[PDB]
Chains A and B, each alone.
Chain A
Amino acid sequence: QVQLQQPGAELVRPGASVKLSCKASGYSFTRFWMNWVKQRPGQGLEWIGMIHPSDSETRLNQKFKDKATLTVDKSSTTAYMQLSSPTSEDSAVYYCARKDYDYDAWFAYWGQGTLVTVSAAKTTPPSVYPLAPGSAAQTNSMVTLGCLVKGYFPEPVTVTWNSGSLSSGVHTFPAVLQSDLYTLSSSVTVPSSTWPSETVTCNVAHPASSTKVDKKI
């Protein structure tokens, strides 16, 4: 099975160098070309560059000249992309794809995705505060619970309810940047035969600092 693997997040200061990894598996690395794309929120997809891995020859966009540098590794079957001096507009979501050829060349498969955050801030472990209403007015048969994750960096943080036990009635909220700190919130709605019978917990796992915070509501 062909699957392309990328890391989830990479922290880099502005003015430094950006190194990313796209791992190829299940196919010959020098046979198929690789492509790098750029997706900003609300803008859509933009095309970065495409490299023949055997000859190490690059094809770049006219606006993207000298910002990006494409190199490959044929021993580990892993393609690289080197960005030089990133800005605040260069923070985006990057993919890598396999280019299959039958006349018009499509993109068959894709990677896991990488969110690159460019800033000078230091990595902060999260502090998770639970949210409970404390009472009920008995006007509805559904009970609303909440979980708040504040004081973390870099984005994102995967937040699940009861280690992924409830796949329905969950809502994922985006992060808001204030004073070099990200913060959002989580919410779940359970029926009244659930929450007195079963204890619903907020599972928070930070992949960047390798910290797992478990709180109870």
Chain B
Amino acid sequence: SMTKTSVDCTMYICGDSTECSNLLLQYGSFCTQLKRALTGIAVEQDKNTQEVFAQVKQIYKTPPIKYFGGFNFSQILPDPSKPSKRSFIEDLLFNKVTKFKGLTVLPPLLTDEMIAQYTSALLAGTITSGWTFGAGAALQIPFAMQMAYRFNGIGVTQNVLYENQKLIANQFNSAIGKIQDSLSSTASALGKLQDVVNHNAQALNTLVKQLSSKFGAISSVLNDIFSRLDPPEAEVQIDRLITGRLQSLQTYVTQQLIRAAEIRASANLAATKMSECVLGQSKRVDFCGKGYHLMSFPQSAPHGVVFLHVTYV
């Protein structure tokens, strides 16, 4: 998802003057179409979180006595001692991603605390309930038998898992420890989500600099046209600025709607990875990551989602 914005017609176009609103009614629906276009984007930003972050309406939790497969799962599980529910990896996620003209920021419907409430239920039932939580009612499959069935889809019989099971705990715990060390030292892996902040920040900072330029008129201030020029001459110079401001406003609605279409196609791929790589076993090549696929671990992220894929190389 992206940052939801809203544009007031009166405060951005006019300087709260009475003569600017009288000529605005002759222009009519020019700011009505641009307000309702950004409203329909803001409805679809909440629909992208419902098809990705929450797959099912049933919340599953982890039992407090934890021994699963001889593995350390404490980095992907949330901390009950912290009043915010966050895992050890997501503390290295949220921290690495970083004057009123009438332009406001709409708050999201789904808070980041409730994204992790959807995340810790899906990180539960992948380990706990197997692949059957999204395909129906949740069965009870113990975790040492889950990796035997995920080897059977890629053509590996159960001889490999049960003999080498002490050597998997050295390989799996060291591979997830390199992910935690890479996100703490290097912030460049989260830079795709940092551009989503930076595409919204450079669009708002360019739009607020439109009022300083004079648009060919003598004075860019609407109060300086009414207090100087003749009332036949003021009606030309006010109408030159509103023609200039509605071309800059329609450019901003056009550029955000194209980025709304690019973030819709990425969220349809992000809903595809939850339905394939997470909730089930996928036999695909270079979809769920390089090599034969086992399972995928989603993590909470600002304006997006971080996938942790377990691959067989």
User: A contacts B directly in the complex (CB < 8 Å)?
Assistant: no
Could you tell me which B residues sit within 8 Å of A by CB distance? none
